[PDB]
Scaffold this motif. Structure first.
Motif, PDB file in Angstrom:
ATOM      1  N   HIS A   1       0.804  -1.205   0.000  1.00  0.00           N
ATOM      2  CA  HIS A   1       0.000   0.000   0.000  1.00  0.00           C
ATOM      3  C   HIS A   1       0.836   1.254   0.000  1.00  0.00           C
ATOM      4  O   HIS A   1       0.443   2.240  -0.569  1.00  0.00           O
ATOM      5  CB  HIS A   1      -0.951  -0.036   1.206  1.00  0.00           C
ATOM      6  CG  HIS A   1      -1.766  -1.298   1.253  1.00  0.00           C
ATOM      7  ND1 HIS A   1      -2.864  -1.508   0.441  1.00  0.00           N
ATOM      8  CD2 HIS A   1      -1.560  -2.456   1.914  1.00  0.00           C
ATOM      9  CE1 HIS A   1      -3.328  -2.723   0.650  1.00  0.00           C
ATOM     10  NE2 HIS A   1      -2.569  -3.309   1.557  1.00  0.00           N
TER      11      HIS A   1
ATOM     12  N   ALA B   1      -6.896  -0.446   8.250  1.00  0.00           N
ATOM     13  CA  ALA B   1      -6.521  -0.452   6.844  1.00  0.00           C
ATOM     14  C   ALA B   1      -6.355   1.001   6.388  1.00  0.00           C
ATOM     15  O   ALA B   1      -7.119   1.486   5.575  1.00  0.00           O
ATOM     16  CB  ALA B   1      -7.591  -1.116   6.057  1.00  0.00           C
TER      17      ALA B   1
ATOM     18  N   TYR C   1      -5.773   2.307   2.736  1.00  0.00           N
ATOM     19  CA  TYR C   1      -5.645   1.208   1.813  1.00  0.00           C
ATOM     20  C   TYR C   1      -6.780   1.221   0.814  1.00  0.00           C
ATOM     21  O   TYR C   1      -7.921   1.477   1.179  1.00  0.00           O
ATOM     22  CB  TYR C   1      -5.725  -0.128   2.539  1.00  0.00           C
ATOM     23  CG  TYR C   1      -4.587  -0.485   3.451  1.00  0.00           C
ATOM     24  CD1 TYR C   1      -3.568   0.424   3.766  1.00  0.00           C
ATOM     25  CD2 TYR C   1      -4.555  -1.754   4.047  1.00  0.00           C
ATOM     26  CE1 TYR C   1      -2.548   0.067   4.614  1.00  0.00           C
ATOM     27  CE2 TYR C   1      -3.538  -2.108   4.903  1.00  0.00           C
ATOM     28  CZ  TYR C   1      -2.534  -1.197   5.199  1.00  0.00           C
ATOM     29  OH  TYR C   1      -1.509  -1.567   6.071  1.00  0.00           O
TER      30      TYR C   1
ATOM     31  N   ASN D   1      -7.976  -4.560  -5.273  1.00  0.00           N
ATOM     32  CA  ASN D   1      -6.581  -4.172  -5.170  1.00  0.00           C
ATOM     33  C   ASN D   1      -5.745  -5.279  -5.874  1.00  0.00           C
ATOM     34  O   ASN D   1      -5.766  -6.435  -5.435  1.00  0.00           O
ATOM     35  CB  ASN D   1      -6.211  -4.028  -3.676  1.00  0.00           C
ATOM     36  CG  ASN D   1      -4.858  -3.439  -3.469  1.00  0.00           C
ATOM     37  OD1 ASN D   1      -3.905  -3.723  -4.220  1.00  0.00           O
ATOM     38  ND2 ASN D   1      -4.743  -2.629  -2.454  1.00  0.00           N
TER      39      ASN D   1
END
Length: 266
Positions: free
Chosen positions: A122, A187, A190, A195
């Motif tokens: 990320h 997260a 993110y 993803n």
């Protein structure tokens, strides 16, 4: 004229970097990191174990706190990690250089650590730190025993692929205390859905909520104390407001569902 930007240092709130003296959690277990970063020393008659170390510049502090506890460099046998980000595994390479410590970690945490947190799924290279090698690779549910404290690894992928909750049984007042040191279940910024670098991110987080809620968990601790309502500056009340693993997981899941909704909106 215009030049490329300078490298940006991973800069954090002062409380993350504020030293504190050892704070006892149970008969063998102490917080020895800063006010806002967890570093757990577990002292046994057959050596010491460190769970996390915080940021890279905390190495000397941890070592000082270890000495204040009677723990010498040779006494430190094992380093365990919640996850291999700069703010929790930062000083690991330096500690390995200055002590007898060997790292045990799962394959995911080992590979991330071996690259000093570069090529993060990320964050890309925004949070690099000195790389270190793991000496032992652990499987889900694997046990490592040091001086009769038995550490069990419970994978809880999400925050990082290699995120782990480590559980052990200490004592207070002659009674067992089942301690759970669980990774973050956030997260932060993110991309959750579709993803390409983490296709099953959502499925993993969901399994990880269920893993965490079911831990043996008389006392929950987290790498950022705030996430479990610990207050390391509060002395004899430090742990008084601490969440249960159940509550910590429920909160994380409700926040994740709200984050999904926002992502779809955004």
């Amino acid at each position: 004229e215009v030049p490329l930007p300078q490298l940006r240092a991973y800069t954090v709130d002062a409380s993350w970097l504020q030293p504190m003296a050892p704070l006892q959690i149970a008969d063998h277990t102490w917080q020895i990191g800063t006010e806002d970063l967890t570093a757990l020393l577990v002292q046994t008659p057959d050596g010491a174990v460190l769970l996390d170390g915080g940021m890279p510049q905390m190495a000397s502090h941890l070592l000082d706190n270890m000495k204040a506890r009677g723990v010498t460099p040779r006494d430190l046998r094992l380093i365990l990690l919640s996850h291999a980000h700069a703010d929790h595994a930062g000083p690991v390479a330096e500690l390995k250089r200055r002590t007898g410590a060997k790292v045990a970690a799962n394959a995911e945490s080992a590979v991330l650590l071996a690259r000093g947190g570069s090529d993060d799924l990320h964050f890309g290279d925004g949070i690099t730190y000195p790389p270190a090698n793991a000496d032992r690779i652990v499987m889900d549910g694997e046990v490592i025993t040091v001086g009769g404290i038995v550490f069990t690894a419970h994978f809880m992928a999400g925050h990082t692929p290699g995120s782990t909750a480590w559980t052990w049984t200490d004592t207070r007042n002659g009674k067992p205390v089942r301690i759970a040191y669980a990774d973050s279940l956030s997260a932060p910024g993110y991309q959750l859905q579709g993803n390409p670098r983490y296709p099953h991110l959502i499925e993993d987080y969901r399994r990880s909520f269920a893993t965490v809620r079911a831990l043996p968990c008389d006392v929950l601790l987290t790498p950022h104390p705030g996430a479990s309502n610990w207050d390391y500056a509060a002395g004899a009340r430090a742990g008084a407001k601490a969440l249960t693993c159940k509550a910590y997981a429920d909160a994380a899941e409700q926040k994740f569902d709200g984050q999904l909704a926002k992502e779809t909106a955004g």
